[PDB]
């Protein structure tokens, strides 16, 4: 089997992407944030505290003939941005882009933090990291991808995120028309539960490539590119007027400046992030100070190849017995 679903930016900055997912019988369609940096499929629901729901579409398990309480099971998650959610669990039929999993754990939110309430466009998350990070207790649950794997034509999914435009998540096949050149594959460590890999270096604009190992995660659920402070400083030093602002919480630059591209290494291959992808617009409405799309990872504890980086590539998440990551230009 295979599946193919379009993913769409939630706003004009590409802050996140939503993908429609069918849950239950008859189908209830929710728009979920596909997140290769976590491993829980959770949704706003009829059980979510009413005051914490503001415009989201909710899953109502009582209206699904295929929903079953996963008795005794609870979940609770916190994300890198300080947001969180928790609740109980149902199993139900879940389909993404034509690909159906029966018995998928659907984690129903009883509580969500303010960031989720305030984002009316995101009805929940669909985790695509390794199932070892799943938070369901007492019995850890498998991700949608892990459940689908044995039925898929090939044990892979791909992320083809758009710049200020829709893109695609495919399951079970590699669309050879969706990228240019070849796909370069690189080793993954699953020791932390992430799609963790090592970039071979970077270049700023037309500058010489610096060969240096950068360990990080491929995370579709993070907006920006977070790299070591040395790398990030070298980038912003090439932007007139750029500075790190502790009041704003990162590097800002005058909206009159031209942004250089940023290249990262995948083995001997190179992915070029165009300068425009690094512009996240005014820090506040009407400001001439713009927020940068490359920021320091210092104090996160991990480097994160988020959407800024991934949307510059066609990315293969290979869940074979020995997992790997593939990157192609497009």
Closest CA to 101 of 193, 171, 19, 7: 171
Helix (H) or strand (E) holding 233: helix 229-236
Closest CA to 153 of 319, 33, 322: 319
Structure tokens at 100: 């159906």
Q: Residue 183 and residue 180: Cα distance in Å, rounded? A: 9
Q: Which residues are catalytic?
A: 35, 199
Q: Residue 234 and residue 7: Cα distance in Å, rounded? A: 33
Q: Do 166 and 187 have their domain in common?
A: no
Structure tokens at 307: 């959407």
Kindly report the CATH number assigned to the domain that includes residue 61: 2.40.70.10
Q: Assess contact for 54 and 82: CB atoms under 8 A.
A: no
Q: Write down the residue that tokens 């369609």 correspond to.
A: 29
SS3 sequence of 135-184: CCECCCCCCHHHHHHHHCCCCEEEEECCCCCCEEEEECCCCCCCCCCCCE
Contacts by 146-155, CB closer than 8 A, 24 or more apart: 146/319, 147/101, 147/103, 147/104, 148/1, 148/3, 148/99, 148/101, 148/172, 149/319, 151/1, 151/99, 152/1, 152/2, 152/99, 153/1, 153/2, 155/318, 155/319, 155/320
Last residue of a domain, one of 155, 174, 193: 174
Q: Do 114 and 103 have their domain in common?
A: yes
Helix (H) or strand (E) holding 303: strand 303-305
Q: Do 152 and 186 have their domain in common?
A: no
Q: Assess contact for 293 and 232: CB atoms under 8 A.
A: no
Q: Residue 324 and residue 330: Cα distance in Å, rounded? A: 19
**Which value, in Å, is the radius of gyration of the alpha carbons in the chain?**
20
Q: Do 117 and 227 have their domain in common?
A: no
Q: Output the CA angle 247-250-195, nearest 5 degrees.
A: 140
Q: Residue 160 and residue 170: Cα distance in Å, rounded? A: 8
Q: Do 136 and 31 have their domain in common?
A: yes
Q: Residue 164 and residue 312: Cα distance in Å, rounded? A: 12
Q: Do 125 and 247 have their domain in common?
A: no
* Cβ neighbours of 69 (radius 10 Å): 12
Resolution reading in Å: 1.5
Do strands 167-171 and 156-160 pair parallel, antiparallel, or not at all (unpaired)?
antiparallel
288 torsion bin: left (phi>0), alpha (psi -120 to 50), beta (else) = alpha
What is the count of structural domains for the chain?
2
Q: Assess contact for 84 and 76: CB atoms under 8 A.
A: yes
Q: Do 83 and 190 have their domain in common?
A: no
SS3 sequence of 237-266: CCCCCCEEECCCCEEEEECCCCCCCEEEEE
Last residue of a domain, one of 148, 174, 200: 174
Q: Do 293 and 261 have their domain in common?
A: yes
Do strands 225-227 and 294-296 pair parallel, antiparallel, or not at all (unpaired)?
parallel
Last residue of a domain, one of 129, 154, 174: 174
Structure tokens at 54: 């503001």
Q: Which experimental approach was used here?
A: X-ray
- HSE-up of 44 (CA within 13 Å, CB side)? 26
Q: Residue 131 and residue 181: Cα distance in Å, rounded? A: 32
Q: Residue 210 and residue 203: Cα distance in Å, rounded? A: 6
How does DSSP classify residue 59? Answer: B
Q: Output the CA angle 51-56-59, nearest 5 degrees.
A: 95
Q: Do 180 and 197 have their domain in common?
A: yes
Q: Assess contact for 46 and 24: CB atoms under 8 A.
A: no
Helix, strand, coil in percent for the chain, rounding step 5? 10, 45, 45
* Cβ neighbours of 294 (radius 10 Å): 25
Q: Do 169 and 270 have their domain in common?
A: no
Q: Give the domain extent around 44.
A: 5-174
* Cβ neighbours of 246 (radius 10 Å): 6
Q: Do 288 and 239 have their domain in common?
A: yes
Q: Do 119 and 253 have their domain in common?
A: no
Q: Residue 72 and residue 91: Cα distance in Å, rounded? A: 13
Helices (H) and strands (E) in the chain, counts: 4, 24
């Amino acid at each position: 089997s295979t599946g193919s679903a379009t993913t769409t930016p939630i706003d004009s900055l590409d802050d996140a992407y939503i993908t429609p997912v069918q849950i239950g019988t008859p189908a209830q369609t929710l728009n979920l944030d596909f997140d290769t940096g976590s491993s829980d499929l959770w949704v706003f629901s009829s059980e979510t505290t009413a005051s914490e729901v503001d415009g989201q579409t909710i899953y109502t398990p009582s209206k699904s003939t295929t929903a079953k309480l996963l008795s005794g099971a609870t979940w609770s998650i916190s994300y890198g941005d300080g947001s969180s959610s928790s609740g109980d669990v149902y199993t139900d039929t879940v389909s993404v882009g034509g690909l159906t999993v029966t018995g998928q754990a659907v984690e129903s939110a009883k509580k969500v933090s303010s960031s989720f309430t305030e984002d009316s466009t995101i009805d929940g998350l669909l985790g695509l990291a390794f199932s070892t990070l799943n938070t369901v207790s007492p019995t850890q649950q498998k991700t949608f991808f892990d459940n689908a794997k044995a039925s898929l034509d090939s044990p892979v999914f791909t992320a083809d995120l758009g710049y200020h435009a829709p893109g695609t998540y495919n399951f079970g096949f590699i669309d050879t028309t969706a990228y240019t050149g070849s796909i370069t594959y690189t080793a993954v460590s699953t020791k932390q539960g992430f799609w963790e890999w090592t970039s071979t270096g970077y270049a700023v604009g037309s500058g010489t490539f610096k060969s240096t190992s950068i360990d990080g995660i491929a995370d579709t659920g993070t907006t920006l590119l977070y790299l070591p402070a040395t790398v990030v400083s070298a980038y912003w030093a090439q932007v007139s007027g750029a500075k790190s602002s502790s009041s704003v919480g990162g590097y800002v630059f005058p909206c009159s400046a031209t942004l250089p591209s940023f290249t990262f290494g995948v083995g001997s291959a190179r992915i070029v992030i165009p300068g425009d992808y690094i512009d996240f617009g005014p820090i506040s409405t009407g400001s001439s100070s713009c927020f940068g799309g490359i920021q320091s990872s210092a104090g996160i504890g991990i480097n994160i190849f988020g959407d800024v980086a991934l949307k510059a590539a066609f990315v293969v998440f290979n869940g074979a017995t020995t997992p790997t990551l593939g990157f192609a230009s497009k």
